[PDB]
């Protein structure tokens, strides 16, 4: 849990010669630090 | 025996917020005032 999560495929390796290239994505952890909820009221009718 | 009888499925309620709607139905008490009674007569031979 030091990551979020990557997307697999895009970690592409690419050899050509003494170079090694690569790329490759991952999303980084984010903390929370704001919360918002949109509460809703309604009514509900009831029989027996 | 303070009434004659009365259908329980006839018993509704409604609630909706505050209100709460009800019915029923009942069949009430009387007291007899006629008591008729017929008689046959019959023989055998």
Known sequence: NEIQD???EDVQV???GNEARISMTVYPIRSFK???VSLVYKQQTLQA
Do not use: D
């Open 6 to 8: 990557f997307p697999a």
């Open 34 to 36: 704001k919360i918002s």
């Open 14 to 16: 690419i050899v050509e």
